[PDB]
Structure formats: C-alpha cells, structure tokens
C-alpha cells in the first residue's frame, strides 16, 4: 500500500473558457452517430446470439480507426443461468494501461432476451445502444486531443455483457458481466508488482450510462462522494444554454435537477460501489415509457435531447483530464 | 422456461366508460360489510390461540357460499419461535387454479401477541382486519361478474398467517406464513406438468394491503416496475371524484399522491419481491396514529374513507381482468 | 416438543427363536423378485425422461396390489440444474400414516444420465435397481404380517428421485429429491394437530440401501448412535449361517465386518442426519468394479448375495417391528 | 418471559411547562463546551493511535467530575481488519445499572484515517466530536437534575470506537464497535437473575447522533416505530421558538420537518435494530458540505445551530425522565 | 503479536523418577472421591433446573476448601433454544490469571433432559459426573504443589454448562457453552494491553473428558499436533503397570492403545478446535453400553478403572507443569 | 454440453512390458534431482519473502532448459490475511495447452511461518521440498517420450503457493493458492469458442503430492472414484519388487495398501473436488514423525524410499498417455 489511491479524493477540474466551449459543441455530429455508430447496433443481440457476435466486432472495428493509441480487451467467461451454462464477453478499451488512475466510463451492450411477439423484436434503443454509440462518437470527436496523453491518470471505457436477465430478476439471475469483472478486479494487483493495491483501487470514478435517449430526461444526484462531480454537470448545462449552444432545450425542464433520490436502483455500478468505487450513475428517474416494450425504438428517440448530452459528456472529460 | 411468463409485461387494463363506474359505485355496501365480514373478525387471533381457529373457519365459510368456484387451500406447517415450535396456517382461495396466470390480492390475519394492559386486548382493526373484510366483500360485489370465467389470466386471494414479530423483529421472527409460502410456490411446477415454470413465474402482479382504515392516508408509489399501474390507480381516485362517486374527500387530500418514496418497508412481500415477482404494496406512509396500541380498535376508524378504497380496488380489478 | 419423540432411543427388538427364523428362510423367493420387480425397472430412466415416468407407474402399482392398507403420496417439485429448471418426483408408501412413529426404509430410484457410448445405455442395476426391487419383495413376504397393524410404530417406504449428479458433483448438482424431502418433513407437523413436533422426529430410524447386488461387500459400521443396530445385523448374519440358510457363503467373507470406518460419504441420507435423525447406512465399501460403467448390467449380478441379504433384512424388519 | 419489555410501547413523556423551558434555556453554555469539551478533541484520533488514547481519556475524566453516580466501563475487545488484527475500545457510562430500562444517548468517537495532505490533517469535527462534546455539555447541564435518579427508568451514554472503515466501507470493514457491543448485550441476561430477557430489551429508545454542526441542516423522520418522538421534538423546537429562546432562527427554515425517507443508512444503530431496538436517528439529509474532507474543521461549524440543538436536547430527555 | 505464542510447539515434560511415582500413586483416594465429590453430584441437573443450582454451589464449594489460590469466575449467558430462551452459567477456575499460558482440564456439567421414564431419573454417571469428580479430586491431591506457584505457564479448569442438546441434536440445538466460550475468548486480549493476541492463544492445549467410568475403555489418538502428549500418556500407563501400581489391568487390555481414527466426534472441543487449539480428546471409542439410558448410573461404575486413570492423569499434569 | 467430459470415465492405461520397466527404473537418478532440484529448495519460503522468489526462480529454471515445450504462467494474485492484504503466485507449467485434455501433477512450494527458535530455521524437507523435486526430476526423466505429444490428451504441473495458513488454520486463513485457481478454470471456457464447458471438465485425474519423504510411509485409498488408478500403483509397486528393481523393500511393508480412511484430510485438493473433479491424493496416513517441526529437514529423509517413489509414479504417468 501507499499513498496514490488517495488522489482522487483532491482531484479538481480545469473548466474551460467560453472560446473552448464553442468548439467543442462544433466539434460533435449527431447526424454521422446516428448512422455510422448507432444503427448497426439495433438488432437482437442477446447473450450467446449471432447478433450478440455482430455487436462484438463493430464496436472494436470502430475503435481501431481512431488515431490514439486504445488497448482493446475481449474477457470472456462461463457462468451458470436459468437455461444452463452460457458463455460471455465483456469489451474493454483503454488508453495508457500503466498508469495508476483512470477515469471509466461504461454502457452495457446486450439486450434482453424476448419471444418474437406480433412478429416483432426487441432491439434496446435506449437500453442501451444509445449510451454504446454515445461513447464512440466521444472518442471519435476528442481523438486529437487524446493522443495528447502519448498527474498519471488517464481513460478507459467498458461495454458489459449480460446485464439483463435471462427468466426472473434475482441476485443471480443478472448482472453476469459486472458480477465478474469487479471481482476479478478486486484480486489483480495494480500497478505491477504491488503488494497491498489492487486495479479496483485504480478507478478514479465509474460513470455509468443507462436508459438513455427519451425526451424530457431527470437526473437525480444519488450519491454522496461523487455529489460535487454531479454538481459540474448542472453548470456545464447552465453555461451553455446560456450561450445556446442547446436546442430545444429550457431553463425550466433541465436534465441534472438537484433532488435527491435514496431508494437505490440494482444496475452494474452495484458490484463497484459495495467495493468502495465511487460511481456517478446518469441513468434518469423515472423511466423511458417504453422501458422493455417493443417500442423502445429508433423512431422514438430524440434527436435533440442526444444531441444535448453528447456535449455536456464531451466536456466533462475534458474539464476531468485536463485537456 | 417457455414464453407465457412475458405477457405481464405487455398486459394493458381494458378501462370502463363512466357508464360502468356508475353502475359499480352503487353495487358495494359499506354497511353490510361492516356488520357481516368485519365485526367476527375483531378478536385476538395470534396464531395457535382460540382466536386464530375461529377467524380462520369464518373466513372460509364466507368464500364457499358465493356461487363463483373458489378452490380453497390451507397451508399448515410448523417454525422455530423465539417461545419454541409453533403451528402456523396460511389461507389461499383460488379461481380457475389450472390457468396459467393469477392476478392476487393479500393480507396477513394474525394480530400481535400483547399481554392484557389494564384490561385491554388488542385486536388489530386496521392491522389487518380491514384488509381481510375489504377483500371478503370485494369477493361479493364482483362474484356474478367473476363467474363469467367459467386470455388465461384469473384472480387469486391469500391470507397469510404470522406476519407479526414474537418477540422482536427480526429476519427470524416475523413473516413467518410469507417466508414459508413464497418458498412453496418457488419450488412447485405450474401449470401442472410444467417443466421449467413455477406457481411464482405465474403471478403477474402482487397487492397487498395492510394498515388500512384511519382518515387522511397517503399512499407512496414505491416501485418502478410497477408504476404504470400506480398510475391507472391515480386516475381511478380522480375520475370517481370528479363524477360525484366518493365521499367526504377533498382533492386536497388525494390517497395517491405519485411523489416517489424508496423502499424500505418490511413486509408479506419482501420474500416474494426478492424472487422477481412484481409488488403493488399499499400501505400507508406515515402509519396510522394508533399503531400498535390498544386504541387501534373500531371506533377509531373513518367509514368513509373504507367506504372509498373499496370502490377503486373493485375498479382496478375489473379493469385489469376485463370484466 | 412433548415426550414421545425419546422412545426410539429406549426401543428393543423382539428377536426370533430359530424356528421362526426357519418360516421366513423360505418364505421369501429370488426368482420372484427378479423377474415381477427387478427387469421391468433395467431401463433408461433419468429424470424427466420416459423411463422415469414408467419406473413410477411400476412401482406404485405393484405396492397397490398387496393385502395391508399401504397409502401412497408423490411428492413432485422443481429445481435449478446446470441444463436449466427440471421437475422431479420422489415416492412415499405409508402404513398408519397417522401413528407416530415409523422405521423407514429408502433408496434412490432415477439412474444416471450418460450419453451413448458404443450404443450401450446406462442403467445401474446395482445403482440403485436392486435395492427398489428389494424393498418391493420385502413388502410381500411380510404382507400376511404387515396386515396385522390394522406400541405406536409403524412401516413407511421413499424411493427418491434424483441422486444423481447432472454434470459434476457439487452440493448444487446431486440430491434433489432428499434435499428437497427432508426440509418438508422438517417443517410438517406430525401428528397431525401437534403444536410443537415434526415428521422428522417421528422418524425412528433410517435405512438406506445403495451399491448392493455384487458379490462379496463389506459393510462398515458408520455412525456410532446406531451401532447397536448394527450389531443386531451382525447377529442375524452369523446365527442363518449356523442354521444352514444361507447360500454360497463363508464366514471368511461375512457381510458384516464390525470394524469402524468414519464416515465420510455423501448420500441421501446426508439431509436427514443433518437435522438429528438416526442412520443405517448399508452401502459397501469398497464400491462394486463396475461403479459407474456400463457393465453395471444384469449379467453382472450374483443370485446367491441378494437372496442373502433379502433374508437379513426380512428378519431385521419384524425384529425390529414385533411381529 | 416477563411483561416488563412491553412498558416502552405506553411510555408517555411529561411535558415541561414555559417557567420550566427557560429555565433549561438558560441552564447550557455554549461557550464552556466549545473551550472544555471541544477543543481538545480535535486531534488525529484513529484507531490504534495515541490521539485515540488522549481523547478517551478526556471523556472519561470530564464525566468522572460530576456528582451524579456514574458507573464507566471500558469495553476492550479484538478484531481483524484490512491492516491486520486490532484492538478497539467503547465507552460506556451508565446511571442505576440496575433498573431494568434505560434510554440511551450515543455517537462515534473515532477519526476516519486519511494519510497527510498538504500538511493537513483529518479531525472530524461533525463527524463526530460535535455530538461528543454536546453528550458531555448534556450531563454538565443536567447534573444536579439527574442525582434525582438515586418507573424503574434512568438513562445511558455509549461512545463506539470503529465506526469508520479502514479501507473502504463494506459488512466486515465497519462498525466495529457496535456490531460487537449489540451482540454481547443480546447474549447478556437482565436484569440479572433472568431467564429469557436481554440487556437489549431494556433499551427503551437509542437516540444516535452523528454528522452534526453545520448551517441549515434539516433530519428526515426515518422510522415510523418512533414517530411519536420525532413529533415532540417538532413541537419542542416550535414551543421555544415562540417563546423566543433560540437564535438566528426561522419556522421557515426548521431543524425536524415532517417528510420522510426511503434508502436508508448504514450507521452504529444497524445492529441494535436489526435486533429489535427502537431508534431515533439524528444524522441530517443532505450530509454537509465538507462531509469526509480535511474542511471539515473548527471554521466550517455553527455555533448557534449547535447551541440550539443543545437547549432541543436537553428539554428532550427531560421530559422522558419525568424529571 | 509477540513470539510467546509459539513457546506451547517447544515444550518438554519433566519426567518423574520410580521413587515419585510411589508418592503419588499413594496421594489419591477413590473411597473419598467417590464419598465427597461424587455422590453429590448424581442429581438431576439439567440448565435451568434446581439441581443445575445444586451442582454449582458443590463445585465452588469444593474449590474454596482448597490452599491453593484460585480464581473463580461464573460467565453467564442467553440462548436461544428449541424450547425458549434460556439461561446457562459455565464455571472457570484459575491459578495465576495473569500467566500467558495455561494448561486446561475440562468437561461438562450439565445431564441430557429428560422424561421420567419408569418413575426413573437420569443423571449421566460416566455423561460426566464421574470426570467432574476426576477434576475435583486432582485438585485436591495436588493441592501441597499446586501453591508452589506463588516459564510464565500455569494451570486452569473449565466446567461447561447446556452440551447436549434439548430435543434433536444439531449445529444449533447442542454446544452451548463451548460455543459461547470458544467466542468469547477470541476476543478478549491477552495478557491485557496486547495488540495482536487474544486468550485463545494462551491455551497450550485442552485436556477433554468426557463418558469416563466403565470397564474396559479404548482411548484414540486423535490428532497429529496432540499425538506426542497421548504417547506420553501410553508411557505413564506402562511404567505404572510395570511397577505394579494399578488394580486388575492386564497389558493386553491397555486403555492407551496406538490406533488411529480420522472419523471425528463432535463435542466441546470443536468450537475451541476450529481456532487452532490443540486438543487431546479423552473419550473412548465405542461408548460405554449404556450411553444414555437410564442404567448409565452408580452401580454400572468400575471402581478400578477410575481409580487408575486418575493416577495417569495426575502424573500428566504434574510433567507437564514440571512439579 | 457435449460428450467429451465422459472420455475420462472410460479411459484406460497402456500397460508396460517388462523390458520397458527396467528402462524406466534405470532411466531416473536420485543424486541428480538432490544436488540440482532439492538442495536449492532447503530455503525458508513463505510468501512474500525473498526465499518466495528465489524458489519461483528456481522452479521456473529448471523446466525452461528442457527440450519438450512446455508453456509458463505465473498466476499472481491478491488476498486478505490475519496479516492484511498480500501478493501470492502460483506456477503452471503445461503442454499443448490447446489438448481439451490434461493428466494433473500437483504439489505446494511455500514454507509455514515460524520465528526462529534457537537459531533453527524452518525448511519444510517433506512438506513440501521433496514433492517439488520429484516432480522435477520426471520432467527430466521422461523429456524424450514426452517430446511425442506434439487421443486428445496431454500433462500439467501446478506448484501452488500459501497452500499453508499463517496464523491458525480455518477456511479463509488457508489454501490461498488453489481456492484462487479452482474458482478462475470453473469461470473459464475449455476448449476456446466453447459455450458450456470449462477448464476444470478438463481435468481428467489431478494427483497431489504431500508430505513425502519419510521411511516406511503408507498410503490409504481415499477416494472411490479414483480407487482403479490407485489398484494400478499397487500393481506397479508390486511388479517392480518382483523384478528386483526397487530398494531396500518389501512386501510385508509396502507403500501402497488396500485400506481405506474415513474422516478426510484438508489440503490444495478440495476446491477441486468440491467441484467434481477424480482425485488420487498421494499423502501417508499417520504423517511423517517430525510434522512441522524444526525436524523436518535433510537428514531426516530417506533416499531409498523417494527413488522407489520416482520409479513408480514415472511408470504411472506414462501408462495413463500411452507413452
Ligand atoms: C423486480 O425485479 C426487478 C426489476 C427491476 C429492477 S431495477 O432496479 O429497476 N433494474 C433496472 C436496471 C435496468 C433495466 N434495464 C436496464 N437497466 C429490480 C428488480
Ligand atoms: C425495529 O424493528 C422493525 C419494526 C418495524 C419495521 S417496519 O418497516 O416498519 N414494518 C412494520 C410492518 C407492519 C407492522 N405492522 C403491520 N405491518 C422494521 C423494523
Ligand atoms: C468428486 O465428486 C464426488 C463423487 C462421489 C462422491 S461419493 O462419496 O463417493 N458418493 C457417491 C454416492 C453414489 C454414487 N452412486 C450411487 N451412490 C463424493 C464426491
Ligand atoms: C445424530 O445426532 C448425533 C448424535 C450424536 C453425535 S456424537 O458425535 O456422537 N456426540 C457425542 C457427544 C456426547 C454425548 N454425550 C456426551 N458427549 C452426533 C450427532
Ligand atoms: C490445527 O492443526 C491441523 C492439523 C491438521 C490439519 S489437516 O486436515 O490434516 N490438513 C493439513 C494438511 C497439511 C499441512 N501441511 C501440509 N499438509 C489441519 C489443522
Ligand atoms: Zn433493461
Ligand atoms: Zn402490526
Ligand atoms: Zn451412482
Ligand atoms: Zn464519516
Ligand atoms: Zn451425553
Ligand atoms: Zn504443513
């Protein structure tokens, strides 16, 4: 053990002038996400599916285009279900694997699995292809910057498997993907050759997507040591609609209301969080109507709304690294 | 498993016309409720006593003279007690126990073991007395409607036993009928024959009530998963007062009042809840002021307000059933 | 509890002078039993297959066709296995099912699931065939006696369902139908009415045959509070031998080897003896050579040691009983 | 058992009249707990340390002053932890050791460990010497009252050691202190002679406090097992208020507001209600500001809010005691 | 931690020579051991009864009588039951408290309940009155020596209440005491002011017994970091036979034979057991025939046989403390 | 899943001619393996210590200068201790990797923890330095045959660390090593792409080697679902005496004797077996005279008896791969 896993505990951002700002909401298509990242990705893709393989290999053929220098990671692994024994694969992507800290950011890229209703499939547009193609088009429109980093802190991303439950939600009938990863992190040590510090104490703070791309989304703060960074997303909001750089988008219907929550939700940042990590969950309150419909869909997301959060979330991370 | 647990899902009330509401509104009596189901039951009846024996012969001798074919089971089985071994029964009355699917309704008919405090003896008239009458008259109001079921989807009743602590709460002295039944009802094929459903995939959605019967209660949506139908439940109390049908009611003073709450609350449902079953609990948020007092008797109960919540369970319940 | 349940540990055979012992020598036949209750059960029959199902009807229509009032319960249920949900059926035959008291004996009746190998097909005529079919010959022999009970102690046969490992064997993966069994008995009141006893208190003792039909076994004395029950089994070996009733038999080679063993193995018998129920586990050590092969066949089989020990427990059975 | 465990159900306080209230008004000092009690707790004071040693024995000494007849034990006890095996200590001061029910004061004594930053050190100043030092002011102010003691009722103070986590919180890396005392207490027969009653029993009401002393905080009624409580500290506040004896002070901006919460908190109180104990939960949502940094320090705190809290207290425990 | 600890894995006896042997075979009387600490102990005593007051008050009585200066404690505690909550008092006696290693004596006190079967009683003779007086009389022949202890080690006995079970024996329904204990010392700090070592390291090993006083007793050696003090005792047997000092013994018939077991028995020395204490289990393998009947009584006791094991034991202790 | 996790139930040796066996018996050399392989492991070597690593090194070594292709990995993990948190690494060492599967020789290369006791250090001779070297020495011995493998089917070596426990052994301080590997092969897919099979479905036999190298050891048969394999080393044992090829030996006192063992022993094989994997654990029953003490070192070991050793577990090994 020794003293550099308490860092984050005094970690500040570097907050941007209104010059930078601009460029950034220039800097950003909703247009090209849309076709290049998002729609390949609505299709059945449920653990151990054909779809499921198809996911797999876009999301690393979009990475490896990229200029910096990404370290992708595929962990497969076995576990028990209610239909049997069924094999998994959680994505990982990461740049600069030595140093000690990185900030996480991460989606789950399966979707549940359903009968074929009204000749009909699920496809998961907000649950959540959306949050997926939302973290390529950031690493797609920060890709000069991020090679910048050839503090040692630096940035990774997770796409988990397995989120969903396969028959009845239960303790162990959800959460495959995080249930694994956390544990095997927890016992790897980090950096090598440590003796007392393990890759869990490495993450700086997990920031989980989730149910993501309706219109009029509410945001609670639920969490006491990651409230102050909660508390930057309410004024990266602020600042730029101020300056409308928003659209369609009032003062009045804001994303990040200050308002507490306490009933938690089980979602993938529960196998981090009862190990100490510190989590910013963006995933609202209350649900996207169509949650687990037929209807959670391409055609009922909005544009606008995406277009938003696109730009608050590319901000964040620059203000956060530094950069 | 198969594909029939998946149609709770996409389950959707069929809603009456104000026409119906009319008709129903007048179709229930406060009065002969009051007198023929509730007042046998205001008794002690912690379980093994006297009490508990009579309370539980009234309750099924009620249910069989209705002309709808109610299957009744008891569930008798023994548990360790903080005053040694006991004896416990469970009540369930079914109909159409073949159909794949079950609507429930439920409460606990024990009341809490006290010694005799001046002369007084507790009775639990909100705690659960009332819930058990409500539903008995429930059975009543609807039964011509109910006969109709000769979508497989059908109603079921449960009244559990031993929902009280002993002693002290505690995960080993309390809900000792809820523990014992929902470990049944995992464990157990359903429909007969199955081969990989159980009599809990079966259950679509669970109420309980309990703690019912003071003026002025507020009732919390507690859930999420199943929200859409605490919603249905707030346009049932809208509606019915803007047509006149309650009484003594002030829009000031609403029952559901959709703010969010957690959580949080022990009760019947817990062990179910954890299976995967989803849970409309209404109990009050604060408690009645009489809570586990010896005042907690008849004369400190709102006809009125009792009056009210039969009207909008019956509706519900037709509404969810299509009746 | 009440005063009953210690009887076992006071109860004492009524042994046979040898005269008697000479009637049921030859009122018992091998070649009875090998063919009306031995060959109908050499078949496939893991859980949930066809042979399953027939082992069952087999098994129930014969104990029905016998003089004394045998009551039969099924007690079918669903479990997790690493292929997903099954269902599975355990057997019970009862005489005075309300007396208080019963020696019991069991073996499990499901066979092992294999793939075809060399188009040979599994079907453990040792594990367990053998035993159901002893137990079966048993309860004809004795019927004329059996008839008698109309000391409160009484006769009850089970016939589990699968011992068996699916996959691999683990506390998860074997057991199914003792596990399950013998928490229902323990949560049962027996007799019926009681307020504070259980089924697995009536429980006198326990037998268990599994392994048997191979020549030459050797038979550990197990567990010590049943010992002197093992000892009886050694008298009743020896004295036949001098009578000149047994067949193809030396003292060199007896049964029942006194010596101590631990011990050590897991069965079904396991949950029961968890919970403070007293065992006599007649399974050999070493196991036969064709343990879990192919040759576990019929041919395999010697006629002399199963018609020995037919006769051993026969008369074990009414010492045990007083008749 | 006995009868007695049901007296805290119909306990009732008696209510101070306005001669009284000012006179308690004016019995505390502010100024002589911030020099005297205060002050010197704020130090490094970890578990294991020598600020640990110093800060126990300010408490001990301080109460050792009084003339009322307090009975201290130190309760020393072992335990494992992320840096290995650790000895902790609780503090304990009870008036009347004998009288079979007590209500009991309690906080944290202990500092969270941090290593230095920037040459400055973590001293927890509302987490928790702020209530420490009011526990103390308490007895000072109440002293010649309590000798009064000699309804077998008195009252009893608890500062737990361990309350932080080492390393990161979770089941087995908190509450250190409390788990251990709650499960001694359980095991512990009173009053003694007793055969099935616990020192646990006696605890009338455990009132925690914990995170006190910043501007404007606002405490949620946690637990509708004590509501009747938390309402006479509502009407205490609002009474002196009225009568004009607090400072800076609005009925707009209150201290105990009637709204509720669902998520809740893990703290020293766990473990007595997990067992049954009734508590109220002193610790305000939201947390303060400077909650877990070195800010949280001597400047950051309100005098006049804790001043006020003090007389709410005092006035309080009174009117429990009927003294 | 310190390295004392490890000084029990260096220990050596100091062997007697044939002339002090002589002395002690002559320093014990069976006739005044069976006369004065005996015979008041063949009472009806099971936790909770009279005679449970009885046997306490004796065995402090004997103790006091004595000249060496002991430490009586009486740890008394609550459990839980199938029958209730109940109260049990273990009985612990000390020389030296403060020494960092004690050699251990220990059995139990307390009979099995029972019904009065036949109008007859049961009071456990050998189940284990007899090792009860086997401690008492030990003390008092060795009484002259045992003072002159005022290597830091010394010597302690242990009483046990509630060993055996209520109603069905099993992990929660026996081993009162020695749970209780075994926990209670894990986490006490021993010698006072320790950082890292608890009473439980301070136990060089513990001598159980337990079924001791019929004919012909067979003792294992049981464990393989206890097996060098039974071969100690093999040697003690011997010398003593080769000396003629013990009464109708033949060498073929020795109590101590090396033979192995693995099979373990559960008794007050699994919970110490499981923490790491070396044990050497004084119990013979098979128990004496009338374990647990009402015969296990007075007239059934060889007056030889326990007059020869005391005077092994005795000699035992006296190497082990080098007196 | 598919069938080839049945191949191991049918497979069967190649058995050795008598030619062959004098090649093998001449083929090994036990000053080789002592000068080389042994000396250099008579180090202290518990983990996390310089001796730790030297052994790593020298293990590591000594396989990589031979010719046949066997494939390293240093497993490193992290994990808690009554010492906190610490660094732990295991050594695998296998052929072709991609053979679904492998023929397992284990042992464990830490040394217990001691202080120094009069300048003695603690090197642990049998326990376990001897195995360590003989698994060496086969690795020489037979590099040409093994040179064959390129019947799927190859050989693995595992060397496990912190298999003893540093303060007292339970099942947290205990087995850090093997628990840690156990769960990660049954979380890992086998062969690659494979969607219900795992690693440990692959391990056919795992053969542990504990406490060898003292005179006249005996082995049991611990496990029936290995005892064929253990009939074979009997054999073996017998034949080569027969030859005339083994030392100092006979058959009146040999290795390898048809006794079994009931109450098991625990070591790095459990987590194997708890998870259905065939055992042949190669540990003498009593354990060597000089257990974990300052005895257990170099000239307490007999040559003679581990060349016998080699021999046979040579001709073993290569009989199960038809080499
Ligand atoms: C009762 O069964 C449950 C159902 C839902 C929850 S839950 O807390 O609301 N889980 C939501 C997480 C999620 C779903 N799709 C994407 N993310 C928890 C339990
Ligand atoms: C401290 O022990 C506890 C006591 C109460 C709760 S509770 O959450 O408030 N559940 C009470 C449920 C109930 C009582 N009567 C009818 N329904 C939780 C814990
Ligand atoms: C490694 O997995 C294990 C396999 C077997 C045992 S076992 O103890 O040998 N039990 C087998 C019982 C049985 C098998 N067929 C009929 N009865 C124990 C563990
Ligand atoms: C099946 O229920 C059981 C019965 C006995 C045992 S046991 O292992 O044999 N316990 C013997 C301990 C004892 C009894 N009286 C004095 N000491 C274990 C379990
Ligand atoms: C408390 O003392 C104990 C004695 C024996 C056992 S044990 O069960 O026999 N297993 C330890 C085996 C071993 C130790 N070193 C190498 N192998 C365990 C603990
Ligand atoms: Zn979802
Ligand atoms: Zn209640
Ligand atoms: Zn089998
Ligand atoms: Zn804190
Ligand atoms: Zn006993
Ligand atoms: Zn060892």
């Known amino acids: 053990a020794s003293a550099w896993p308490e860092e984050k505990n005094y970690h500040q951002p570097a907050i941007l002038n209104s010059s930078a700002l601009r460029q950034i909401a220039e800097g950003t298509s909703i247009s090209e996400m849309w076709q290049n990242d998002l729609q390949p990705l609505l299709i059945e893709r449920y653990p151990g599916s054909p779809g499921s393989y198809a996911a797999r290999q876009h999301i690393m053929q979009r990475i490896q285009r990229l200029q910096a220098d990404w370290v992708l990671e595929i962990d497969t692994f076995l576990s028990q279900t209610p239909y049997g024994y069924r094999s998994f694969s959680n994505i990982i992507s990461t740049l600069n694997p030595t140093a000690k800290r990185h900030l996480v950011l991460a989606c789950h890229y399966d979707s549940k699995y359903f009968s074929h209703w009204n000749n009909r499939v699920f496809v998961g547009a907000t649950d959540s292809a959306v949050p997926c193609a939302m973290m390529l088009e950031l690493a797609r429109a920060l890709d000069k910057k991020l090679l910048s980093l050839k503090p040692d802190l630096s940035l990774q991303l997770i796409f988990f498997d397995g989120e969903e439950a396969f028959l009845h939600w239960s303790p162990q009938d959800s959460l495959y993907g995080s249930r694994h990863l956390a544990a095997k992190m927890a016992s790897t040590p980090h950096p090598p050759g440590a003796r007392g510090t393990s890759q869990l104490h490495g993450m700086d703070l997990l920031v989980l997507l989730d149910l993501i791309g309706a219109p009029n989304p509410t945001f609670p703060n639920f969490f006491p040591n990651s409230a102050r960074w909660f508390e930057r997303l309410q004024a990266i909001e602020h600042e730029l609609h101020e300056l409308g750089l928003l659209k369609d ?54 544009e606008s709304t995406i277009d938003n959060l696109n730009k608050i979330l590319q901000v964040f991370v ?6």
């Open 249 to 302: 988008h009032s003062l009045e219907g804001r994303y990040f209301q200050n308002y507490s929550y306490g009933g938690v939700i089980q979602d993938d940042h529960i196998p981090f969080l009862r190990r100490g990590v510190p989590v910013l969950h963006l995933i609202p309150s209350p649900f996207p109507e169509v949650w687990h419909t037929m209807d959670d869909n391409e055609e009922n997301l909005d």
């Open 318 to 323: 620059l203000e956060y690294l530094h950069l």
